[PDB]
Amino acid sequence: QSVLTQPPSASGTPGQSVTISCSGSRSNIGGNTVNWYQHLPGMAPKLLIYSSNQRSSGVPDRFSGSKSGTSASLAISGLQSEDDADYYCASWDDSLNGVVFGGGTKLTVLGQPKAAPSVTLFPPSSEELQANKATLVCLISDFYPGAVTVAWKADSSPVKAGVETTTPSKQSNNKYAASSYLSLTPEQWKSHKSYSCQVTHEGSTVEKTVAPTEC
């Protein structure tokens, strides 16, 4: 329970529109102006709307705010990939004597073009091998939608232990990235013909392979 109530999610496809609601009470929205913030991964929040219906400098007019009684709305038209973000309403609250925030709404712009992942696989470095360790590094980029699974093989045999795989994250180009790491002993690494990282995205699996004797 946040003091202001927002739906957890909203969505549309490119060029569509959405409205995100924010519900409060007499003590906050009822007697005070509303602010709206956009928040992207990695960066500070940005003010979009203040005084309930005024656009901050430089914000396009496809973002619009409104308020009546004890509820407020943020409307977004002409949806673009870069609109994928969290949106928060906020207000002063006269009973609490402080600023209150809604819980945020995650806007997802769906219907973007499907894109298969690009995969780069690196073998252990000589330096790491000399320290009696070995890490294979599988970097996965430029995919959409943002979901993959990763499998590893020694020669043709599945390897499950020693695997560390990230959740996918948005890149600056609005496609997704992930990484997977396989830990081996140097003895394991040198004893096989090769190792492979197999990446499955929407049912289609692609792979890269590295070998100890490559240079």
Partner: protein
Amino acid sequence: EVQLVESGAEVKKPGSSVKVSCRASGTFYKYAINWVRQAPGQGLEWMGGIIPFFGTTNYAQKFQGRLTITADGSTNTAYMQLDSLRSEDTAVYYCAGPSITESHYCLDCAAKDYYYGLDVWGQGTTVTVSSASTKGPSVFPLAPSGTAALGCLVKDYFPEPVTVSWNSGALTSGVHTFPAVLQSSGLYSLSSVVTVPSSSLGTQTYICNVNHKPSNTKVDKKVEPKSCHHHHHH
């Protein structure tokens, strides 16, 4: 107009205190400087604010008694001190304020009259509360295999964050630093990769510059193609 710059990443044991600074690039005294944080997987949370001209402070009820906000007009710097830290306090901490001006500044108004929409933000300060040991990274070159990929593997550090540049910042095109994985050991690892024309591998130099502030560690690693006939050791 004014810019806000916060102090660097911090790592604290439970029960300790953290202080984060917020320096403005000029006078920033009339309107409320707010502090807002975001814990992992949580929404933005308002902590409090100060109106420097009056010294008046407002705090969220949740933090009353362990949060102190200061504004030192003489140095244009504001501060947040959070005492008795717990794991839930692990978060990015922002300071922020408004770009407001007025024909006539009110000398006797209610505190709420100086709180506005926040359009000036600091860059944020990552604070991690943990009993775990701080540990800097080991860095290994990822040799290049018509483009080529090469990079640096930044292994086994704690806590977040790490930054990576290439050639002291001179190389930016084609750089992709990936989000870190939190490993089963409780330590982080990440990689940074640069995509380069394969043709220029012979002459051009690639050095990754890794910075881990919580451990006061910096690593430079030259990344070269792997030699077939020459296996070097020290």
